[PDB]
Amino acid sequence: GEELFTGVVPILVELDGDVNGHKFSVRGEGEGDATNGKLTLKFICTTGKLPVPWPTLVTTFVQCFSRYPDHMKRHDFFKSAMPEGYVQERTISFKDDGTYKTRAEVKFEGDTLVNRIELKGIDFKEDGNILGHKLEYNFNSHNVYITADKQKNGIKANFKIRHNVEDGSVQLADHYQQNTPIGDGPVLLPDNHYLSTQSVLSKDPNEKRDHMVLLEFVTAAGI
Amino acid sequence: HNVAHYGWIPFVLYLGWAHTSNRPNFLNLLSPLPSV
Amino acid sequence: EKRAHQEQTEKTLKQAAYVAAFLWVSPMIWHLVKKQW
Amino acid sequence: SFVRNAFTKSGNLAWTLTTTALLLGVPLSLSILAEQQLIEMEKTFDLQSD
């Protein structure tokens, strides 16, 4: 399926969302690598100021580039449905604030990757933790937990993230992700495994406007 | 129709029971093995 | 706009009843066809 | 109550054993009936001989 796409594929992201009547649109041009499990992504904001911070935007903004050894090739789902299209729906429950409810479809339109993301954030308070802009420009390594549900033969993700607040606290938030493939071809149901991922956040000094540069290394272990 | 979640099946079973010359019991009436 | 659609469906029901009465008397029309030619 | 749930799990076990015995038995019954048909064909041939 996607075994010929082991090299660098250009990644276009389309993010449209509204948080308490605020319009924002972040787009970016970048690439990811599968043979070495890395990603070179440079995301450039078109709207200008970001109402929501970049740690709450990264997990939504392409896990098909995992460096895979020869012993876990049978337990991979994301190279079976990616050409047909891979639609994911997430429920990210922030503590003492609102929730992230997003619709994202990761499918190959044309030759480049087009990620149509439609996000909805409800029941949010502006004087809380996320919308007060107390999040620093850093990320923590997160072990994504993947379990397979045979009711709709898909992938459900139940894992938690650690967001670093500037004043000295931490944010406990859990992900409830439902993944639905489009096509009805060869589907693979894996076992319980985890992606040992890490991320580096830096900034480009040769850019003028508000821009986000992300470096992501994805490795897999467990089975 | 609170009876009707369990009720139409023994009514048609009683209608089948009333027009049968063998007149069997409910163990013969429900179980799918053939028995005379 | 609801009352115009309601009288449109009432005219549809009247045309259905008129064509039902037409299909009822049609045997006599085909007997009149068989009387001629 | 608990008797209803015991009836439900007994009905599930009875369905499980019924469809397992049906799936195992009915091709085996088809093979056994074909063997009875071939044995009856051989026996009618022997009755034609005698």
């Binding site: - | - | - | 056994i32 063997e35 009875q36 044995i39």
Partner: protein, 35 residues
């Protein structure tokens, strides 16, 4: 009721010994039809 990998190997061993007793029995010969 405590579940362990030792419970799994005890269940597999009990199933194997129970299958061996089920398969060397004359009830298994009664399960074989003669025709």
């Amino acid at each position: 009721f405590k579940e362990s990998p030792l419970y799994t190997i005890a269940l597999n061993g009990a199933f194997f010994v129970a299958g061996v007793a089920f398969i060397q029995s004359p009830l298994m010969d009664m399960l074989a039809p003669q025709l």
